[PDB]
């Protein structure tokens, strides 16, 4: 009755043997996840190779956040010393506005000070808890799946591995979608 | 001259050695836990059948927090992730309600963000540092040694280890017990 | 062109070379230190055999603190449970005044909630960040390097690094000091 995340994962396999487009497989995939996480606005970012990034499929749930959804964002937004967390140890973090600490998941949890920067980042835009999760197509960052909420909760491993799932199907997506598109 | 880990331990095995009454082992126990620990209250806390427990020994430091002894606390106020880490990992948990944080280690400690409601219910008892080791009688989630003060200080690894040493030793003295008392 | 700690320690180096005092050598580096750290205030604490210690080195940015050179400071300043961890495990010890949290690196960096006698005596210095590594003649404690910022900061394990190399460098400057005024 209540959705785990080997359904969620069934579909976006079924969208991708449909041969949707990538886009499309993505907007449909992130209402799925946001309803699944339970968090008031689940996000997909998707980098340029300028290192700027752009929000391209989002699901927020009631307006308890405001929408973010095709705005882009420069690449100072995210500093080369936290880029490489993602890219090198594929970290998933975890950013308690509350308590200012950030708890970072290499693929237990240890919790540090987060950058005053990043939190203003954050408390600017009405968010008290995030959790980001990198995804990749091969070896190449292709974006992030983003998931905020407008007040203080906490983040369990499970939730961590269900965000695993699902961005390591995503890759499965992407991969496929180039493939598929091969001149 | 004045109080170790050892010569607490001691007087436990004695008390195991001559049979007091069960009762009588843990209310003592728990007052030199107390004096060992220097909290301004440590109890002794048995769990029902049913999830819920009962405050069973309790030592204050004049009158610095009120009695709760005798009281029985429902089984939601430890949900059961929250059990789940004291069955099977046999956690001990601190909390530090001045910085919203909370340290478990399993049998170094990891500190991560406390649920709100567990500060807010700490809070509402006027406690600023809670210690909670699990008791157990062989495999059996027993109860928990509480140890809580009513200002902010820190604990140790070395107090979790004497904390540790006694529900070991506790953990003895209560099955034997049943052992002893069987019809 | 810019400064990184291989030109500070190659510095540090040269004056030995040079056959300078050690007083001078300790004098000369910590500007260096402050420079390439970017801190507001970065000094060389000398421990007395009683325990307590002395401001024998200071460097500050733009008197954007106050002058510590040549204070003395009580061994009650540091704890027996601090000075061991200084002792047995060399400990580099961050504090971050925001988050009432203290980050230790033994010889990864786990946080912990500090003090609240600690953190009143960096507040009522106008400090929001200290980041501490002991320095070493031999097996003898033999000081402190210390970093003060007036602002909130965040320390990453690079620059406790760089710090490390600093204390490393001293030590040997130290020792060679002590051979050359053996009587
Ligand atoms: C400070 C002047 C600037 C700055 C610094 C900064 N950013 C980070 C870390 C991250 N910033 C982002 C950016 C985003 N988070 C999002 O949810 C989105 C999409 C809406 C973006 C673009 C991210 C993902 C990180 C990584 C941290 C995480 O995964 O949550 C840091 C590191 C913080 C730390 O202490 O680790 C810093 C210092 N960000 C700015 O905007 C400034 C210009
Ligand atoms: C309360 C009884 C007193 C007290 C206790 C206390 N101090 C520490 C930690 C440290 N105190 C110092 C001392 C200094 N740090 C400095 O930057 C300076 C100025 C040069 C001094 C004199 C140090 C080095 C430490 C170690 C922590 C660190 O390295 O950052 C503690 C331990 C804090 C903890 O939680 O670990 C305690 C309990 N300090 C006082 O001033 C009181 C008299
Ligand atoms: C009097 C003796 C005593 C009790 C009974 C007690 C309850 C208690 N609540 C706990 C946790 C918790 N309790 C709750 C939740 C709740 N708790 C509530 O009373 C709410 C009804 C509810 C919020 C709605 C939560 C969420 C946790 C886990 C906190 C965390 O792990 O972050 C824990 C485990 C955390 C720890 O080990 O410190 C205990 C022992 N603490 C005590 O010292």
Redesign the interface.
């Known amino acids: 009755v209540s959705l785990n995340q080997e359904s969620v994962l069934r579909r976006i396999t079924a969208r991708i043997r449909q041969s949707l487009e990538l886009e499309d497989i993505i907007t449909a995939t992130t209402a799925e996840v946001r309803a699944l996480l339970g968090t008031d606005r689940v996000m997909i970012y998707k980098f340029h190779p300028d290192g700027s990034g752009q929000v391209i499929a989002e699901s927020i749930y009631e307006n308890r956040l405001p929408s973010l959804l095709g705005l882009n964002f420069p690449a100072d937004d995210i500093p080369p ?1 936290a880029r490489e967390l993602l890219v090198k140890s594929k970290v998933r973090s975890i950013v ?1 506005v ?4 950030i ?1 970072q998941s290499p693929v ?9 920067c990043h939190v203003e980042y954050l408390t600017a835009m009405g968010v008290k808890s995030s959790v980001v999760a990198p995804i990749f197509c091969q070896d190449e960052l292709w974006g992030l799946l983003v998931s905020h909420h407008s007040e ?1 909760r ?1 983040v ?1 491993e499970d939730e961590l591995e269900a965000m695993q799932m699902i961005v390591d199907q995503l890759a499965v997506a992407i991969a496929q979608s180039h493939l598929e598109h091969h001149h």
Chains 1, 2, 3 share one sequence.
């Open positions: 010393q308690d509350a308590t200012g600490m708890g237990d949890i240890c919790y540090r000070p987060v950058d005053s203080n906490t369990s």
